[PDB]
Design a protein around this ligand. Structure first.
Ligand SMILES: *[C@@H]1O[C@H](CO[C@@H]2O[C@@H](C)[C@@H](O)[C@@H](O)[C@@H]2O)[C@@H](O[C@@H]2O[C@H](CO)[C@@H](O[C@@H]3O[C@H](CO[C@H]4O[C@H](CO)[C@@H](O)[C@H](O)[C@@H]4O)[C@@H](O)[C@H](O[C@H]4O[C@H](CO)[C@@H](O)[C@H](O)[C@@H]4O)[C@@H]3O)[C@H](O)[C@H]2NC(C)=O)[C@H](O[C@@H]2O[C@@H](C)[C@@H](O)[C@@H](O)[C@@H]2O)[C@H]1NC(C)=O
Ligand SMILES: CCCCCCCCCCCCC/C=C\[C@H](O)[C@@H](COP(=O)(O)OCC[N+](C)(C)C)NC(=O)CCCCCCCCCCCCCCC
Ligand SMILES: CCCCCCCCCCCCCCCCCCCCCCCCOC(=O)CCCCCCCCCCCCCCC
Ligand SMILES: *[C@@H]1O[C@H](CO)[C@@H](O[C@@H]2O[C@H](CO)[C@@H](O)[C@H](O)[C@H]2NC(C)=O)[C@H](O)[C@H]1NC(C)=O
Ligand SMILES: [Cl-]
Ligand SMILES: [Cl-]
Ligand SMILES: [Cl-]
Ligand SMILES: [Cl-]
Ligand code: NI
Lengths: 100, 280
């Protein structure tokens, strides 16, 4: 029971990013232990209010995972991110969305 | 048939100190959630119109009562016995129990428990089996619970008699959602790759259901064995997302394509063609 597991954080859009076209921003947080965790989705560094998430589940190896998501319209300049806080993390970790 | 083949319930019981613990639970068909546990009310949340399968409301209510009684007594006993096998706070206990339909028609049941994220016990042949990671603590625990009246008998009934008929009822009641076909969309991206003159190509495949899919970088009809599949990631509303990547030398990227095969496509494979020089 002794060893804690830091979260893996993956940020991705439901659809290929196209400026002006509504989309869905997903943040998948997985591999972590224990289950207590805080997750926010950010628009230009501000917490987004209308964010949904799955109920807690876990992998075969007992690591927890959560899916957080919101609708969003990508633009040229707008920045979006996923911000996670967990006992393994000293400060909240911010993974930026990168449509590539 | 397609779609999920198993039902399970999960438990996450978090013990903060001597006096405070809280349990989360839910019910699942493979990775699709069909039940929630509402700790506000000690009742189940039914997430689809068919989530009760072919069970009557009386039987569902009875099962809810069993879980409600278990969730409350579990916490009680764990605390009372946390002094007995020295256990430091905080700690977390996990549990998964359910059954699965196999090729040939057989239904196999399972129950596993974890402590601090390591296997602790399992139920095999309606007996409590301590896992080696659980140490002597898991041995003392199994020897304890088997003495408490009714527990193993109720576990045996749920695992081997109630779960198999629940699974069959709910797999049928939900087949319109469970066995639907949802076509993926696909698209290509690029970006730098480690090492000189190397590129990483990415074939994104999103929105497909059910989960089995085939994605391969190709040269004509030659599958590129260097294709790396990422882990399958969830979208909201029961579809999936997958990245298939290929590390290729610059100047050997031309001629590459990405081919997607999926049960929803009716043999109309998706084929994407990589073009160079910023021609997307
Ligand atoms: C929810 O659905 C379950 C599955 O139903 C079937 O599948 C779904 C998808 C639909 O197609 C349904 O229309 C369909 O029925 C129900 O469970 C199943 O119920 C049937 C009917 O009672 C039952 O069949 C009986 O099986 C026994 C033999 O079972 C043993 O052996 C088999 C191997 O052969 C093994 O798999 C089992 O585990 C057992 O070890 C058989 O003896 C019975 O024969 C008697 O009755 C028939 C008439 O049906 C007659 O012709 C014979 O001559 C003899 O009298 C009968 O064939 C299935 O075994 C059972 N399946 C499972 C996995 O449990 C479920 O029904 C409820 O539970 C049943 C166990 C039984 O108590 C029913 O009366 C209940 O309504 C249904 N509802 C609920 C609430 O679960
Ligand atoms: C092996 C893992 C189990 C270890 C957990 C041990 C800590 C025990 C905490 C629970 C205390 C229970 C209180 C004592 C007895 C319960 O009432 C007893 C039985 O009651 P009895 O008939 O003996 O007496 C009449 C009481 N009623 C009048 C109240 C019915 N019930 C229980 O213990 C509940 C068992 C928990 C089962 C957990 C899940 C098993 C697998 C689920 C598979 C899913 C399939 C279901 C389909 C939907
Ligand atoms: C349809 C009927 C409605 C039911 C809806 C489902 C709700 C599920 C909520 C209940 C979840 C609890 C069931 C989990 C049981 C798992 C087995 O428990 C263990 O493994 C405990 C291991 C103990 C480790 C001890 C240290
Ligand atoms: C166990 O943890 C809970 C918090 O989860 C503790 O609750 C606090 O207790 C202190 C001391 O009595 C109060 O002043 C606080 O107001 C409580 N906070 C909340 C949010 O309830 C509880 O006391 C702890 N128990 C033990 C025995 O340490
Ligand atoms: Cl599936
Ligand atoms: Cl409860
Ligand atoms: Cl019972
Ligand atoms: Cl497409
Ligand atoms: Ni850090």
């Amino acid at each position: 029971p002794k060893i804690q597991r830091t979260p893996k954080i993956q940020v991705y859009s439901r659809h290929p990013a196209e400026n002006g076209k509504s989309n869905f921003l997903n943040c998948y947080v997985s591999g972590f232990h224990p289950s207590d965790i805080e997750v926010d989705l950010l628009k230009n560094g501000e917490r987004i209010e209308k964010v949904e998430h799955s109920d807690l589940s876990f992998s075969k190896d007992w690591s927890f995972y959560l899916l957080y998501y919101t609708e969003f319209t990508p633009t040229e300049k707008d920045e979006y991110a996923c911000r996670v806080n967990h006992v393994t993390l000293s400060q909240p970790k911010i993974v930026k969305w990168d449509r590539d | 048939f397609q779609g999920p083949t198993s039902f399970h319930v999960i438990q996450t019981s978090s013990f903060t100190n001597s006096t405070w613990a809280q349990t989360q639970g839910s019910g699942w068909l493979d990775d699709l959630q069909i039940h929630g546990w509402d700790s506000d009310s000690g009742t189940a949340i039914f997430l689809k119109p068919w989530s009760k399968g072919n069970f009557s409301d009386k039987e569902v209510a009875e099962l809810e009562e069993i879980f409600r009684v278990y969730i409350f007594g579990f916490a009680r006993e764990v605390q009372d016995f946390a002094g007995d096998f020295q256990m430091k706070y905080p700690f977390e206990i996990q549990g998964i129990a359910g059954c699965e339909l196999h090729s040939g028609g057989a239904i196999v049941s399972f129950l596993r428990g974890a402590l601090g994220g390591l296997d602790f016990l399992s139920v095999k042949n309606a007996s409590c089996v301590p896992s080696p990671e659980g140490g002597s603590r898991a041995q003392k625990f199994c020897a304890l619970i088997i003495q408490y009246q009714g527990i193993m008998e109720t576990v045996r009934i749920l695992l081997y008699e109630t779960c198999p008929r629940y699974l069959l009822g709910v797999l049928n009641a939900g087949k319109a959602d469970l066995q639907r076909q949802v076509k993926p969309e696909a698209w290509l991206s690029s970006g730098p790759s480690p090492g000189p003159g190397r590129l990483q190509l990415v074939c994104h495949v999103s929105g497909f259901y059910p989960k089995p899919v085939w994605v391969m970088w190709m040269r004509g009809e030659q599958e590129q064995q260097g294709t790396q599949l990422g882990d399958i990631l969830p979208n909201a509303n029961w579809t999936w997302y997958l990245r298939a990547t290929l590390d290729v030398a610059d100047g050997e990227a031309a001629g590459l394509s990405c081919r997607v095969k999926h049960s929803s496509l009716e043999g109309q494979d998706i084929i994407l063609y990589w073009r160079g020089s910023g021609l997307n």
